[PDB]
Design a binder for this molecule. Structure first.
Ligand code: 96L
Length: 130
């Protein structure tokens, strides 16, 4: 219905705003664009599902997220990919892992403070019915 399309549009507006706030944070610069194979040569082989904030914006605009839970699965993926590709004790690895964990905690903290639980429940019930 049109009222359901209004719901999903509001969801996309909310998701773009959260994504933009993550993208402008200087600590999350390395997550703003897809990992470049030429700059990080052993990446695209080890990481089967690459994910970054520009790809998240593209998925919002293609109507790929019908709930915040689906959006959070992709945020979790940016963090899990960084932990998998950088598991060493080296400070360079530890820095990316900390920035990844921080990116994930920030997205969860924004959503915990700003997302109305009934709005998410409405998104989930429309999704489940389709
Ligand atoms: C995401 C993601 N997950 N893991 C990593 C990572 N790992 C490095 C691999 C090398 N070791 C060296 C050590 C410690 C073993 F000596 C440190 C950890 C590096 C980058 C990263 O610094 N990028 C930079 C960047 C900048 C803007 C937007 C996106 C990106 C993405 C990525 C890239 O493809 N190019 C940039 C360039 C400076 C290499 N991102 N990244």
């Amino acid at each position: 219905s049109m009222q359901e399309e209004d719901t999903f549009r509001e969801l996309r507006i909310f998701l773009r705003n959260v994504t933009h706030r993550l993208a402008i944070d200087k600590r999350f610069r390395v997550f703003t664009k897809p990992v470049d194979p030429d700059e990080v040569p052993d990446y695209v082989t080890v990481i089967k599902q690459p994910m970054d904030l520009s790809s998240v914006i593209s998925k919002i605009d293609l109507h790929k997220y019908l709930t915040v839970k689906d959006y959070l699965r992709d945020i979790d993926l940016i963090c899990s990919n960084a932990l998998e590709y950088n598991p060493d004790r080296d400070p360079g690895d530890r820095l990316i892992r900390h920035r990844a964990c921080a990116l994930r905690d920030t997205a969860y903290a924004i959503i915990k403070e700003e997302l109305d639980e009934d709005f998410e429940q409405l998104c989930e019930e429309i999704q489940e019915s389709r």
